[PDB]
Amino acid sequence: LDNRPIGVFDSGIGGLTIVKNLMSILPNEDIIYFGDIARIPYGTKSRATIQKFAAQTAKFLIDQEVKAIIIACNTISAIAKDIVQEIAKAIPVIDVITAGVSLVDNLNTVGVIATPATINSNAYALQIHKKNPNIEVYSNPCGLFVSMIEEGFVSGHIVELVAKEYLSYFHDKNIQALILGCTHYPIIKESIAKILDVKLIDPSLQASKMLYSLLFENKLLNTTKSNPEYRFYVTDIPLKFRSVGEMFLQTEMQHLEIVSLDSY
């Protein structure tokens, strides 16, 4: 089990940051990244469809005999965590919403921004309230942010105006921190910080640390002496993928392969 890869489970593109994080704390581990690039975005799809898609990716990863899964995507974590856990059986699953919650559960008043699917699922408020039901949670979807960022609008006047549209909801709420509850949003954190001067919470590294602690405590660390294998399995490769993905990864996606979920 020790020398099996870690599965990084994404909807697509923004979860590459978890790969980056893992490479910084677990440099000897093999990683399989999965992105369902053919069917993104998930943030604007129904709960039934997000669950259907996540069951397929889960089965694909389990067939690769990963030793652990991290769900990098907040939208999949919000809506399909249990579907994924049920398929993974004895394979542990770490998720980014659990990570986010762990960073705010001593506050009194918390804001959350995320995809429409995530916010409409109510997952962040529910999970925060499982820790403490008296934490005040204010949530607002930021529907345009994902496409905006994928199209390269990552700073400047457009980004600032779209952010004002979505973040003005929080001005009278006296929040103590704002959860960046979508993988894409930390890219624009500097623009967010200009509009809403509060602590911004990015749960990706925390999620990676949770996976580190689990592997360490359970003695499931890779002890091979060969170069780690980083495999990027995706269901589409459109022309902009290399450039937008590597904006998140911060290094080359050197071993990239087109796969299909047709049999899953």
Ligand X SMILES: N[C@H](CCC(=O)O)C(=O)O
Residues that bind ligand X in the complex, under the rule CB under 6 A: 11-14, 40-43, 73-75, 115, 118, 146, 182-183
Give the one residue of 153, 173, 194, 228 binding a copy of itself; rule: CB under 8 A. 153
Question: Least separation, in Å, of the C-beta of 115 and ligand X?
Answer: 5
Catalytic residue check, 142: no
Nearest to 11 by CA among 61, 74, 104: 74
Q: Is the peptide bond before 41 cis (omega within 30 degrees of 0)?
A: yes
Residue number with the smallest Cβ distance to ligand X? 43
Catalytic residue check, 73: yes
Q: d(Cα 242, Cα 181) in Å, to the nearest integer?
A: 24
Token representation of residue 70? 């991290």
Question: Least separation, in Å, of the C-beta of 239 and a copy of itself?
Answer: 4
C-beta of 13 vs 112, nearer to ligand X: 13
Question: Least separation, in Å, of the C-beta of 112 and a copy of itself?
Answer: 13
Please indicate if the annotation marks 156 as binding a ligand.
no
224 Ramachandran zone, left/alpha/beta (phi>0; psi -120 to 50): beta
- The binder of 263, among ligand X, a copy of itself, none, by C-beta within 5 to 8 A per type, is a copy of itself
Please indicate if the annotation marks 197 as binding a ligand.
no
To the nearest 10°, report the CA torsion of 71, 76, 81, 82: -140
Please indicate if the annotation marks 28 as binding a ligand.
no
Task: Count Cα atoms within 13 angstroms, Cβ side, for 210.
Answer: 23
C-alpha torsion sign, points 22, 202, 153, 156 = negative
- Residues 79, 50 contacting (CB under 8 angstroms): yes
Residues 80-99 that bind a copy of itself (CB under 8 A): 80, 82-83, 85-86, 88-93
C-beta of 23 vs 125, nearer to a copy of itself: 125
Question: Least separation, in Å, of the C-beta of 150 and ligand X?
Answer: 9
Does the footprint of a copy of itself cover residue 134 (CB under 8 A)? no
